[PDB]
């Protein structure tokens, strides 16, 4: 089972803008999560070939990872903060759906999600 193409990070047909919230998501939120000790398995798409997980993309049909999110933020792919927040939430949810409660990868996702939620509670009001 080969890997799918990664999620899109550039598309001239999709509208986009910069907002103060999206700039916070890159400079504060992504930056903090990216340097966490447990970030590395989330820094690129799940490579189901390398991991010998041929079922992964039979079960997870909306893949997401922080490397994709980072590129989307650096490329100003998004129209609003909610789109980007949804990508982080999809990344976490996928991990919790695919893996067993208590698996190491789930504990690593949960630590990142705890930091994410702190930072999202501090999301600035739109200017
Ligand atoms: C960089 C993406 S990669 O695919 O190229 N490499 C890579 C390497 C290891 C991975 O898993 C572990 C990592 C650390 C521990 Cl302690 C335990 C498992 C994963 C991985 C990530 N996710 C989000 C999963 O849901 C997942 C589910 C099952 C197996 C592996 C993974 C990906």
């Amino acid at each position: 089972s080969m890997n799918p193409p990664p999620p899109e990070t550039s598309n001239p047909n999709k509208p986009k803008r910069q907002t103060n919230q999206l700039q916070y998501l890159l400079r504060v939120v992504l930056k903090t999560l990216w340097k966490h000790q447990f970030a590395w398995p989330f820094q690129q798409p799940v490579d189901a070939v390398k991991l010998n997980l041929p079922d992964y993309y039979k079960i997870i049909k909306t893949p997401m990872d922080m490397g994709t999110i980072k590129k989307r933020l650096e490329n100003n792919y998004y129209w609003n903060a909610q789109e980007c927040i949804q990508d982080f939430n999809t990344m976490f949810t996928n991990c919790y759906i695919y893996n067993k409660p208590g698996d190491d990868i789930v504990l690593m996702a949960e630590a990142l999600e705890k930091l994410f939620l702190q930072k999202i509670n501090e999301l600035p009001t739109e200017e």
Side-chain angles (χ1 to χ4, degrees):
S1 242
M2 316 160 65
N3 292 312
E8 190 175 92
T9 54
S10 292
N11 180 351
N13 283 314
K14 174 182 188 303
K16 67 259 294 182
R17 55 177 184 168
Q18 294 182 64
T19 74
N20 68 301
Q21 291 179 334
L22 284 163
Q23 188 154 293
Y24 174 87
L25 281 158
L26 175 56
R27 295 183 190 200
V28 179
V29 182
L30 187 280
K31 193 181 155 0
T32 306
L33 266 66
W34 191 270
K35 77 190 208 283
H36 192 281
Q37 187 185 43
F38 290 165
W40 72 265
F42 305 91
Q43 287 176 347
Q44 312 175 67
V46 168
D47 183 339
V49 174
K50 172 161 88 177
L51 296 165
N52 323 292
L53 310 168
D55 72 348
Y56 184 84
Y57 292 108
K58 276 86 183 206
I59 293 155
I60 297 305
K61 293 308 191 173
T62 312
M64 192 48 55
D65 65 279
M66 297 196 297
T68 297
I69 296 166
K70 180 169 178 284
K71 286 181 203 79
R72 287 177 173 194
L73 286 165
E74 289 172 346
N75 296 352
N76 310 299
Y77 175 84
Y78 294 117
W79 188 259
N80 61 37
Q82 174 183 18
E83 294 179 339
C84 175
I85 292 166
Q86 177 66 75
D87 282 345
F88 277 102
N89 284 139
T90 294
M91 187 177 70
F92 294 128
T93 295
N94 288 343
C95 188
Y96 305 146
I97 293 164
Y98 182 76
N99 299 288
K100 309 182 325 283
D103 277 355
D104 279 349
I105 190 65
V106 169
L107 294 174
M108 287 177 84
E110 285 174 339
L112 297 172
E113 191 186 8
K114 180 180 181 142
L115 184 49
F116 179 70
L117 190 45
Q118 176 62 38
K119 289 318 208 163
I120 291 308
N121 283 337
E122 305 175 44
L123 187 72
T125 60
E126 182 152 31
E127 88 180 359

